[PDB]
Amino acid sequence: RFDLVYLVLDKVDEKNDRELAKHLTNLYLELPVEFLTMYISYAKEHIHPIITEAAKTELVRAYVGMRKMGTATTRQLESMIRLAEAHAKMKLKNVVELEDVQEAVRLIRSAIKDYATDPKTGKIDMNLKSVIQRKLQEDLSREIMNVLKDQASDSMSFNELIKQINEIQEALSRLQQEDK
Amino acid sequence: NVRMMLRRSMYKLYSAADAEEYDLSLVENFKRLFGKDLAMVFNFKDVDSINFNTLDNFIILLKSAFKYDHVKISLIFNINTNLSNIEKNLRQSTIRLLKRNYHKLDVSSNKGF
Amino acid sequence: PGFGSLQRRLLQQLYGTLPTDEKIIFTYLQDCQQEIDRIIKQSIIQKESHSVILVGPRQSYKTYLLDYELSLLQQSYKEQFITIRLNGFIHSEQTAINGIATQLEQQLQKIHGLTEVFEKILLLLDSTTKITVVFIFDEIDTFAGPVRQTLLYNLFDMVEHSRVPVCIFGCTTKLNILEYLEKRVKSRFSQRVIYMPQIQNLDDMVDAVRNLLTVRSEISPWVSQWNETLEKELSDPRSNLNRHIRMNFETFRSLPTLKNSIIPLVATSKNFGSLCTAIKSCSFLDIYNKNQLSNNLTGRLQSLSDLELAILISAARVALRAKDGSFNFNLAYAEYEKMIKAINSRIPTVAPIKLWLKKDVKNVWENLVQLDFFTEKSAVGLRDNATAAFYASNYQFQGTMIPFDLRSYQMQIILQELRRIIPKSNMYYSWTQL
Amino acid sequence: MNVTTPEVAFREYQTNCLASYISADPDITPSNLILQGYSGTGKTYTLKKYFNANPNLHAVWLEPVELVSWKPLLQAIARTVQYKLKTLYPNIPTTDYDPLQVEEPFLLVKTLHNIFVQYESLQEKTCLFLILDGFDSLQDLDAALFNKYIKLNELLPKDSKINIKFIYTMLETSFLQRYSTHCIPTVMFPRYNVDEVSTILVMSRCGELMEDSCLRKRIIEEQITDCTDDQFQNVAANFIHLIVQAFHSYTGNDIFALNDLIDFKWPKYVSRITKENIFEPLALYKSAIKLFLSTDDNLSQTYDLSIISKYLLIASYICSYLEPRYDASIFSRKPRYLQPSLFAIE
Amino acid sequence: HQIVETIFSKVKKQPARENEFASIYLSAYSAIESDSATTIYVAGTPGVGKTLTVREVVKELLSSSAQREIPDFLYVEINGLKMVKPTDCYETLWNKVSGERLTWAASMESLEFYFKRVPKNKKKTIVVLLDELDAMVTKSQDIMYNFFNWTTYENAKLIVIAVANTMDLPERQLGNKITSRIGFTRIMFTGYTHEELKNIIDLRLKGLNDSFFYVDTKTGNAILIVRKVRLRMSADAIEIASRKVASVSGDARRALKVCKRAAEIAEKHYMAKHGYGVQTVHITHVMKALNETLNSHVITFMTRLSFTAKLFIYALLNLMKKNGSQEQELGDIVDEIKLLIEVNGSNKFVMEIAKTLFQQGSDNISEQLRIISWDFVLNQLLDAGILFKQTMKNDRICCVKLNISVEEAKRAMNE
Numbered sequence A: 001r002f003d004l005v006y007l008v009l010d011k012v013d014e015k016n017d018r019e020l021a022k023h024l025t026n027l028y029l030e031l032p033v034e035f036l037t038m039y040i041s042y043a044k045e046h047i048h049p050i051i052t053e054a055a056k057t058e059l060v061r062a063y064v065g066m067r068k069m070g071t072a073t074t075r076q077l078e079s080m081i082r083l084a085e086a087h088a089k090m091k092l093k094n095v096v097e098l099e100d101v102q103e104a105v106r107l108i109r110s111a112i113k114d115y116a117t118d119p120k121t122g123k124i125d126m127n128l129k130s131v132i133q134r135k136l137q138e139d140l141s142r143e144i145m146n147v148l149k150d151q152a153s154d155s156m157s158f159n160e161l162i163k164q165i166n167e168i169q170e171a172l173s174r175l176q177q178e179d180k
Numbered sequence B: 001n002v003r004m005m006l007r008r009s010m011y012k013l014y015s016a017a018d019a020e021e022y023d024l025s026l027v028e029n030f031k032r033l034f035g036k037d038l039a040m041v042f043n044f045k046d047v048d049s050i051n052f053n054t055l056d057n058f059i060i061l062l063k064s065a066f067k068y069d070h071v072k073i074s075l076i077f078n079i080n081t082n083l084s085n086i087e088k089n090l091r092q093s094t095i096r097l098l099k100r101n102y103h104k105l106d107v108s109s110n111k112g113f
Numbered sequence C: 001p002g003f004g005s006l007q008r009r010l011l012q013q014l015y016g017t018l019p020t021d022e023k024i025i026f027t028y029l030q031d032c033q034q035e036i037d038r039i040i041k042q043s044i045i046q047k048e049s050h051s052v053i054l055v056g057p058r059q060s061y062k063t064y065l066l067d068y069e070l071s072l073l074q075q076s077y078k079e080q081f082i083t084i085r086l087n088g089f090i091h092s093e094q095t096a097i098n099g100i101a102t103q104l105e106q107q108l109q110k111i112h113g114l115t116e117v118f119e120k121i122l123l124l125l126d127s128t129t130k131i132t133v134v135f136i137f138d139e140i141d142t143f144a145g146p147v148r149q150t151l152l153y154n155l156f157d158m159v160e161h162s163r164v165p166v167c168i169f170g171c172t173t174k175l176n177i178l179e180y181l182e183k184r185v186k187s188r189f190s191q192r193v194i195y196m197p198q199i200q201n202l203d204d205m206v207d208a209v210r211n212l213l214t215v216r217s218e219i220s221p222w223v224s225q226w227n228e229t230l231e232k233e234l235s236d237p238r239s240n241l242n243r244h245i246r247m248n249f250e251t252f253r254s255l256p257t258l259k260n261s262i263i264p265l266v267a268t269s270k271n272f273g274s275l276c277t278a279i280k281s282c283s284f285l286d287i288y289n290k291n292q293l294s295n296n297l298t299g300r301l302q303s304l305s306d307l308e309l310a311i312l313i314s315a316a317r318v319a320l321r322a323k324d325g326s327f328n329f330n331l332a333y334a335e336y337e338k339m340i341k342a343i344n345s346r347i348p349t350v351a352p353i354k355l356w357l358k359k360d361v362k363n364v365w366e367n368l369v370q371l372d373f374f375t376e377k378s379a380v381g382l383r384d385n386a387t388a389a390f391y392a393s394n395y396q397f398q399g400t401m402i403p404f405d406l407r408s409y410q411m412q413i414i415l416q417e418l419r420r421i422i423p424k425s426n427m428y429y430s431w432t433q434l
Numbered sequence D: 001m002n003v004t005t006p007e008v009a010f011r012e013y014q015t016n017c018l019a020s021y022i023s024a025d026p027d028i029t030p031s032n033l034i035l036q037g038y039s040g041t042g043k044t045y046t047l048k049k050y051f052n053a054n055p056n057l058h059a060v061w062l063e064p065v066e067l068v069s070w071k072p073l074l075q076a077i078a079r080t081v082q083y084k085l086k087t088l089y090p091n092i093p094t095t096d097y098d099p100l101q102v103e104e105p106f107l108l109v110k111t112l113h114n115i116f117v118q119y120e121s122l123q124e125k126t127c128l129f130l131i132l133d134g135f136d137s138l139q140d141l142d143a144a145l146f147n148k149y150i151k152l153n154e155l156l157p158k159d160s161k162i163n164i165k166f167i168y169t170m171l172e173t174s175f176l177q178r179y180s181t182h183c184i185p186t187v188m189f190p191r192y193n194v195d196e197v198s199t200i201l202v203m204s205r206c207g208e209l210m211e212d213s214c215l216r217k218r219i220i221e222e223q224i225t226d227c228t229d230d231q232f233q234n235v236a237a238n239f240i241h242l243i244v245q246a247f248h249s250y251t252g253n254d255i256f257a258l259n260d261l262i263d264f265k266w267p268k269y270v271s272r273i274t275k276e277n278i279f280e281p282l283a284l285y286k287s288a289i290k291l292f293l294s295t296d297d298n299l300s301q302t303y304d305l306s307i308i309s310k311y312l313l314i315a316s317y318i319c320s321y322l323e324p325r326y327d328a329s330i331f332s333r334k335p336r337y338l339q340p341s342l343f344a345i346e
Numbered sequence E: 001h002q003i004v005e006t007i008f009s010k011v012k013k014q015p016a017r018e019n020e021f022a023s024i025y026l027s028a029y030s031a032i033e034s035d036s037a038t039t040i041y042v043a044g045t046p047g048v049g050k051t052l053t054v055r056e057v058v059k060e061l062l063s064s065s066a067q068r069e070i071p072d073f074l075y076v077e078i079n080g081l082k083m084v085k086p087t088d089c090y091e092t093l094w095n096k097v098s099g100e101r102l103t104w105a106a107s108m109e110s111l112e113f114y115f116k117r118v119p120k121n122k123k124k125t126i127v128v129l130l131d132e133l134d135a136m137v138t139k140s141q142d143i144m145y146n147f148f149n150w151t152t153y154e155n156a157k158l159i160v161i162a163v164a165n166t167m168d169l170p171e172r173q174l175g176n177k178i179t180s181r182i183g184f185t186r187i188m189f190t191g192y193t194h195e196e197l198k199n200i201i202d203l204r205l206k207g208l209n210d211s212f213f214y215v216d217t218k219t220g221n222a223i224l225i226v227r228k229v230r231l232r233m234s235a236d237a238i239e240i241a242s243r244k245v246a247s248v249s250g251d252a253r254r255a256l257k258v259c260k261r262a263a264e265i266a267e268k269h270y271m272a273k274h275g276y277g278v279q280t281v282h283i284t285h286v287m288k289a290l291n292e293t294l295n296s297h298v299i300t301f302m303t304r305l306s307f308t309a310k311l312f313i314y315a316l317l318n319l320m321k322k323n324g325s326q327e328q329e330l331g332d333i334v335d336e337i338k339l340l341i342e343v344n345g346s347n348k349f350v351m352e353i354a355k356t357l358f359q360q361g362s363d364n365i366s367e368q369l370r371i372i373s374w375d376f377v378l379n380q381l382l383d384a385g386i387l388f389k390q391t392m393k394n395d396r397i398c399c400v401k402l403n404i405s406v407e408e409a410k411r412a413m414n415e
């Protein structure tokens, strides 16, 4: 029945250890809290966000997706609006946005760390180049090579190609390396 | 096993026909070997101790003999208790083969005083 | 009427029975084919004894190259080469020597129109020449086993000592051939192991398909139309036929397997006019593929009746609740009884779904074991060799004596697959879960 | 020559596939071909119908069901091929080899080569098909056995006129999957659907039951002057449909099981046919309710035992299912579904 | 057609065991001259010339017999890996000595009677070579015993030479009864050094290195001494051939084969450039032969597999690393394949790949339980010897185990 549970693990790695050590050791040599409290008080004081239709619709799909991987009780669906309203308040927007809902869903997923969680036994991968990565890259490269010349132009903007295909940068960079 | 069953059956069948004057090819060739039709009576002397899977396979094997126009087969079942053991042990497909033409007779020494 | 000649030509081309003049070698095969040709002709013409093994998976056109080379040599080197064939699947180690002797006798007779055995082979060759002997062996790994290696040992020994040149070509799917060939035979073997090349590009398979389907004889005036349509369908990467070709490539890369599906399409074709329509869309390969899968678990599960399916669901439930995953008839029927009681209990009553008898269920239980949904607790299954099969047919297991209703079974289909496959419209779909 | 296609219903893909692998040219037909289908899927019937539709073909039929083991399997092949070659070409003067000398597959190859040498003077190459129905039904079978039949054609002299084009039929699927990498051209048979089984049994048994002695006795007894063979077939079809709808869940979509119920219940069903049941199948069903409520496949105070015997059995059942722990607890004055355990005489 | 031989032909067509030769000859001469009977035991790795040294000693003893330094003697050669049945040894030995054709049981008794009972003055000395002695081992080891036991008889006048794989085989496998009779008369052959192999290579090519040839320009046929051409093989090429082979095995035949392969490679270069003045066999030609001996086709073969095989191997490796074990349940494998397919997003490429893999990409026919050609690839990885499986008809409780190393599969997948 909690809203968010965070698995803040510690991994031994020289690079991250160096980052943390250099962040910490130099701090004790030799926005302000007033503004932080002012902002916190103001947001609670004024904004009362209301959930929009589009933001509401994504809740159904998100909860169903969490459901079909069965511990996805109905309690987390309370959080799927509690966090959205708080995000809307933090943005100071007077309504809850679809982006706010998606960000809240992402936050819940990252807190629980489902993507690294084994659906079979609930265990967690330690590491979180693969053959599926190779296949996806190869298929994407083939499709973009077909599309870039299927249009009645020799070339096109990469933003339009990304929007056309995703509905990428490494594949096009590799093609440029091959002068395609 | 079915192999030993067929071998011994054909051995005894040949021995019996040898006094007139090992496989199903003997049954096929019997009319050309001795000039007479063959009628077989099979006496299952003690059914309860027989491996019922082997018996079922043997019955299915003997079913192939009906292609011959000169062979007739009769089956004798020495049952100690009842049809219940056979219905429990044999497959329900073979029971239907048996049941199309069967007779039931109580030969016990005790019958109504 | 005249299309039949073209169809027969195409079928013959597919089956590889073309005359050696018209035979084709793929570009990805040609590099090794030329090397094999070199070894063969250096052994025959230059009279040099040599030994070679071809390695690769089955249906890799492995022995096809040897057949091509020997068929080519037969056209112009009739008296020069002697061929001996053996195969380890059929020829046991007892019959191999007799096979060699008989085949040599036949070859010598048609040409003219036990160390001493091999020595007499050499003496006969010397006395009839006063001719390189080409051994071809299928499945070296079969001879190279626990059987004490003598025949191949002698053949490789003869390479150095023969007065008449001796050449050996073998086949084997195993990549670990040198493990099977013991150290003595390894020392005596020339060790020119040739691993066959693999199809490794989509363009490679497209070119192989073109080589198979190309017609280079003007048998019929529609040969040009055939080649035109073939190039039309191979030219566009998004072609319907090229779709099947790409899918086949990406699934498995053995070309003969794809030929095994192309041949039905060609043979089923009735006339050129209908062939022109059929070859383009090519919807028949889907039918072939679904037929290939029609007898797996899904195909068998799709045909069962409601009672059979319900008993299967109950047995799967019993297995699921079981740590060992095993179940018996009694527990399955008890779960059937409970599920029917529950189903009836969820029904409004009367104001003033047959629980089948335990005897009639036996036919359904037998059917569910015939169709390989169930299996015994320790079912070894099909034995590998005849010697073990004899013992298996001799020994009687516990499962052959224990009662019908108490024989333990395990399941081949897990309830997850049941719920995935069983339609939601089925009246027992709600019981697919726990 | 061109093969003619048969009209077998519910198999109109495999009958077309057989025309792909079987033809008059021995240089076209593959060296092996496997037809796969479970019991009652129609494989033997379809193949026999196809061969009977094209008499110009040449074939040998053997059943491993009769041929218990592999040695008879080879011996029958040799003997039947010898007989068939004599039958097809009596004019050619030929000699004999003993079919009982085949002890190993190499000896089969030797005998086959020796026989084919005799027919070397044939005008054209001949395509011969050897048919083994139910290859996996062999009683003594192993995985290495089938490999010996795949790669056998190429041990023959490839220039010989007589080419053996083996044909196999298989029942199981755990058998065929062991040989997937060989890419043998395979034709598949699925289980018949319920509608298919219903149509096939009607097509098959209608004429069998329209002429049985019992019904034509009962018609005479009941003086049915207006009875016609068309109505006879309709009565038989009603009987078959009733059995199917009553026992499909009991038998499945199996042709063999339903046939035997049709045979058994047929006399008893006939006994209820009267003057009033000629035109109302509903009334006949009502009269025959007790026949449908019971399968009657059963072969039929169940066990006559002395009191000592009954008490011994009662005690034995307790022994075989009660833990040894509780004997002193229960009997001294001081589980329904599992397999029974052992117990001592004491 | 005429047999065309190029300049490299004589190189392919074409001294280091004197201490072993002297030791064997000294023991053989002492036993034969004394009219005694004894057993000689020979062991060593294949390819070190054990048989060749024995043949050289026997030929020299025949020459000594021709000079009548030693009396006449008979030589019989028998190899263990050449007989069809073990009982044929008794028939063969009696046939070569007496000319009879009796059965193995009668021949063995005849041999036993002959060596033991026949007077010495009524015999000719018999020397028997039992090549591949360890291949004649039967259940009762009678061949290992009887042949050596006959040498203990003073009336036998029989010399038996045995070649086996190991020196301590009588102690390791045979009983003390046979071990005592064999005794100390054992000789071991050690593999050649690289310099010895280099010397042997040069010995075979003594008259061919730096030699001139007359080569027909139209056909390439060469005659040892139409234009004048010279041939050479680099000493560095021979050195690397000898060093690499000596580091692998002592087999002398491998060195000869390597030079033959190197000559063939140089011959291919000569033919390719001419398309039918010193032809130096460069070290690259030898290194090509050495590389093909060392390089394994396993890695490239695995990298050349279809996507299905690589996916299967990757799933198996992931299961091994998750489980900490090597073998995995087959149903677990087919479930992990689905997990790995579905762990990715719902992208259109992922959808198409899944449709192709799981339901053949068919138009409407779908709902398969396992990926297409799963059985095909499972049998392909097993017939190639890469993948091992234990046999049960319960498809999902069986175990699948790897034959290749745990390290090289990841290397192949990472390429």
Ligand SMILES: Nc1ncnc2c1ncn2[C@@H]1O[C@H](COP(=O)(O)OP(=O)(O)OP(=O)(O)O)[C@@H](O)[C@H]1O
Binding pocket: C014, C015, C016, C017, C056, C057, C058, C059, C060, C061, C062, C063, C064, C067, C138, C139, C171, C172, C173, C256
């Ligand atoms: N004489 C032939 N004529 C035509 N095609 C042939 C001939 N011999 C073999 N083939 C072809 O060989 C293919 C079957 O595989 P193939 O014979 O190459 O394997 P293999 O070398 O026997 O394999 P393995 O490794 O099992 O020994 C088929 O496509 C078939 O057409």
Ligand SMILES: Nc1ncnc2c1ncn2[C@@H]1O[C@H](COP(=O)(O)OP(=O)(O)OP(=O)(O)O)[C@@H](O)[C@H]1O
Binding pocket: D008, D009, D010, D011, D038, D039, D040, D041, D042, D043, D044, D045, D046, D134, D137, D171, D200, D203, D204, D255
């Ligand atoms: N399409 C059909 N039309 C008519 N009858 C059919 C059809 N299909 C099957 N049958 C009938 O079904 C019967 C089933 O027996 P079949 O000959 O197929 O046995 P089988 O499956 O080969 O044998 P086994 O199970 O013993 O290996 C056939 O004998 C035939 O009478």
